[PDB]
Structure 1
Amino acid sequence: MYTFVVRDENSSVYAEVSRLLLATGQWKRLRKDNPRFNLMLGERNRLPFGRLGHEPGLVQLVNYYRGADKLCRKASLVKLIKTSPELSESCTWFPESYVITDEREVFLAAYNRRREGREGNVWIAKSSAGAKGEGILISSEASELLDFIDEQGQVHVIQKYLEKPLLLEPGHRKFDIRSWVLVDHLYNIYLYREGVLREEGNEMFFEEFNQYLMDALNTTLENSILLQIKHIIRSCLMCIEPAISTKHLHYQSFQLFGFDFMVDEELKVWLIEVNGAPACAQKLYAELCQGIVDVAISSVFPLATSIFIKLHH
């Protein structure tokens, strides 16, 4: 049968994955450092990608894409969106962002321009090292931000704040959407058909959001939002495929991604960020993890409907 290792005890998603793998009766969990494995549920920092695929007679799969941090870190994401021709110099779905190769002058120029226009200047300062709540600093005065920017250790990025977001009006509520995307070894892009809006736990599933759109705005989740969401997912993942694809490599990669979007009042979807090690909604761990096993793992190590929208390309 197949063997696998778990080098990240903190992964709830892959904790469930390993549990179910063991329950199938055809998978053997080795010790963290055993090299004779078929699958690695690897760590999040310095995953030894260089030591994979050199094990005689073992097909080795791992749950991470080398180079995917270019998309999962806001500084890197901004650089990729600005530079890569695949994404426009200013594509219509990413906020005006500046990482402070240093663009202090350019963000100062545009912020003076919006200063004199007198009709939009709310920005946001954040870093890829925000401590699960700490680090964010929204400010109408960007002098405040820049001053403290330099009064901070690591690099920061300044995005244009969503002044006029969509509001779940039975409460005048701001929200963001989380979508889960699996990329398998073939680089098929599978979108998880169930997202969440961040009611119990401040969590609203898609059926309720869809019914709300139908009743209030006479629209549907699909048409108003999900087409844009699929477009952005496809754009982002197709942009970096040449850099990260393991199609002709000695080891293979799959990865779960968490895409954070928010929606303005005109029902236009914006990309907030991409998270490479996402958590999951409590009620859907059982379904999503089973889908991961079916599509990303058993696809490579076969045994003896779909919960996924295949974002073809």
Structure 2
Amino acid sequence: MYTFVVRDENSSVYAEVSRLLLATGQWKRLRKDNPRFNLMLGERNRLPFGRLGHEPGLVQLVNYYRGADKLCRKASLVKLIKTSPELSESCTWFPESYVIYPTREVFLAAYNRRREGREGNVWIALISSEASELLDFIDEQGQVHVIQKYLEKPLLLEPGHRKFDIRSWVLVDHLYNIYLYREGVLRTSSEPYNSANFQDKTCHLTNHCIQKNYGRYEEGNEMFFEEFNQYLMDALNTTLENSILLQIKHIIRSCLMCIEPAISTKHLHYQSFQLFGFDFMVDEELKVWLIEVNGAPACAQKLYAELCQGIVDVAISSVFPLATSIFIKLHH
């Protein structure tokens, strides 16, 4: 029998992974601060990575990648893309982004370029049109904010003239295989989108929660991949694979292949896996855009069973073996 502890009680995902683990009759659950675990489903901040991999006779495995915050923190993610050659300022799937602190680095010189063509100058934190309106919002909070080119021409689902984002769940295992969960989710705004009233950020901000209309066209403002592909076929004569999924698989492979030397636990004394949630935005031209990478990501209720079982088979049992796939291996 393998042992495991559990240090994030708020984890809807690994809540399941603990539940399923025990139920194999081969996993037992020690107490939070018992060091003699094979597996740490650990906390989100200050996870004690320097304490893992020092238990003689214990193969230790944790469900986070020390370093992954570079890709999962909004200011960090910008910093990562501007300065790694692998991504370059000439990066074609990330919206223009600048880091401004509150007490404009080269943010101002871009906005003025837009005065040169009166081009779209919507941005986000939160959404304004004049720089002053926004800049005074970041010093009003006190922490570091990042501002980005709002996507003024997004793709709208009809019936509804409606906005949405796509969350893919990717699982990186101890070997740095990159597994895309085939089941995706579109988080859709029930509110018809319009570009006059930004401050009415309910048809602009696509967060499932912030949508406190909730349930009109599809249940829970969530359309899955089978419905959306059908709509794409019928409405645009294309498919989800060709028009959108390729690019998503390019971005996921790219972001993760970038930071690999910095987080790979290949020759290390403990080992990491981590589930990520990638959040994309497909514009009117069927171009996929990367918005946020989420390091502690929730699943969609319908899929927890399937995803959390695949976590066990791919990331947990691969290491601790016991007595087709739901994943796309992104090849590198």
* TM bucket normalised to smaller: over 0.9
- Is the CA contact (8 Å cut-off) linking 2:103 and 2:139 kept in structure 1? no
SS at match of 1:105: coil
Query: How big is each residue's C-alpha offset from its partner over 1:40-59, in whole Å with a ceiling of 9 and x where there is no partner?
Result: 00000000000000011100
Q: Distance in 2 between matches of 1:4 and 1:88?
A: 41
Deviates further, 107-116 or 238-247: 107-116
SS at match of 2:113: helix
Per the TM alignment, residue 105 of structure 1 is displaced from its structure 2 partner at its CA by 3.6
SS at match of 1:259: strand
Per the TM alignment, residue 104 of structure 1 is displaced from its structure 2 partner at its CA by 1.0
- Is the CA contact (8 Å cut-off) linking 2:101 and 2:145 kept in structure 1? no
SS at match of 1:117: coil
Q: Cα–Cα, structure 1 residues 58 and 105, in superposed 2: closer, same or farther, change >3 Å?
A: closer
Per the TM alignment, residue 152 of structure 1 is displaced from its structure 2 partner at its CA by 1.8
Per the TM alignment, residue 151 of structure 1 is displaced from its structure 2 partner at its CA by 1.9
Per the TM alignment, residue 123 of structure 1 is displaced from its structure 2 partner at its CA by 0.7
- Is the CA contact (8 Å cut-off) linking 2:2 and 2:27 kept in structure 1? yes
Deviates further, 233-242 or 86-95: 86-95
Q: Distance in 2 between matches of 1:121 and 1:73?
A: 24
Q: Distance in 2 between matches of 1:76 and 1:90?
A: 18
Per the TM alignment, residue 90 of structure 1 is displaced from its structure 2 partner at its CA by 2.5
Query: How big is each residue's C-alpha offset from its partner over 1:249-287, in whole Å with a ceiling of 9 and x where there is no partner?
Result: 000000000000001000000000100010001010000
In structure 2, the gaps of 5 or more residues are 188-217
Query: How big is each residue's C-alpha offset from its partner over 1:117-167, in whole Å with a ceiling of 9 and x where there is no partner?
Result: 112111111xxxxxxxxxxxx001121111222222110001000000000
Per the TM alignment, residue 116 of structure 1 is displaced from its structure 2 partner at its CA by 2.4
Deviates further, 40-49 or 81-90: 81-90
Deviates further, 299-308 or 98-107: 98-107
SS at match of 2:105: helix
SS at match of 2:116: helix
Compare the two structures and name the one with the higher helix fraction. Answer: 1
SS at match of 2:5: strand
Q: Does 1:248 align with 2:267?
A: yes
Aligned to 1:237: 256
Identity of aligned residues (%): 99
Q: Distance in 1 between matches of 2:176 and 2:101?
A: 31
Per the TM alignment, residue 35 of structure 1 is displaced from its structure 2 partner at its CA by 0.1
SS at match of 2:246: helix
Per the TM alignment, residue 103 of structure 1 is displaced from its structure 2 partner at its CA by 13
Query: How big is each residue's C-alpha offset from its partner over 1:179-233, in whole Å with a ceiling of 9 and x where there is no partner?
Result: 0000000000000000100000000000000000000100000000000000000
Aligned to 2:169: 180
Q: Distance in 2 between matches of 1:139 and 1:293?
A: 44
SS at match of 1:54: coil
SS at match of 1:166: coil
Per the TM alignment, residue 102 of structure 1 is displaced from its structure 2 partner at its CA by 10
- Is the CA contact (8 Å cut-off) linking 2:97 and 2:149 kept in structure 1? yes
Query: How big is each residue's C-alpha offset from its partner over 1:66-98, in whole Å with a ceiling of 9 and x where there is no partner?
Result: 000000001000000000001021200000000
Q: Distance in 2 between matches of 1:230 and 1:35?
A: 38
SS at match of 2:280: strand
Q: Distance in 1 between matches of 2:9 and 2:141?
A: 31
TM-score normalised over the length of structure 2 = 0.89
Across the aligned residues of Structure 1 and Structure 2, the Cα RMSD in angstroms comes to 1.3
SS at match of 1:272: strand
Per the TM alignment, residue 304 of structure 1 is displaced from its structure 2 partner at its CA by 1.2
Q: Distance in 2 between matches of 1:195 and 1:25?
A: 31
Deviates further, 102-111 or 59-68: 102-111
Q: Cα–Cα, structure 1 residues 238 and 103, in superposed 2: closer, same or farther, change >3 Å?
A: farther
Per the TM alignment, residue 101 of structure 1 is displaced from its structure 2 partner at its CA by 9.8
- Is the CA contact (8 Å cut-off) linking 2:68 and 2:295 kept in structure 1? yes
Q: Cα–Cα, structure 1 residues 214 and 31, in superposed 2: closer, same or farther, change >3 Å?
A: same
Structural mapping, 1:39-78, within 5 Å? 39-78=39-78
Per the TM alignment, residue 26 of structure 1 is displaced from its structure 2 partner at its CA by 0.0
Q: Cα–Cα, structure 1 residues 310 and 210, in superposed 2: closer, same or farther, change >3 Å?
A: same
Q: Distance in 2 between matches of 1:287 and 1:120?
A: 42
Runs of 4+ in structure 1 off by over 6 angstroms are none
Q: Distance in 2 between matches of 1:312 and 1:304?
A: 29
Q: Distance in 1 between matches of 2:109 and 2:289?
A: 23
Q: Distance in 1 between matches of 2:111 and 2:317?
A: 51
Q: Distance in 2 between matches of 1:200 and 1:11?
A: 23
Aligned to 1:191: 180
Q: Distance in 2 between matches of 1:277 and 1:194?
A: 18
Q: Distance in 2 between matches of 1:53 and 1:116?
A: 57
SS at match of 1:262: strand
Q: Distance in 1 between matches of 2:102 and 2:248?
A: 30
Structural mapping, 1:48-127, within 5 Å? 48-100=48-100, 104-125=104-125
- Is the CA contact (8 Å cut-off) linking 2:181 and 2:326 kept in structure 1? yes
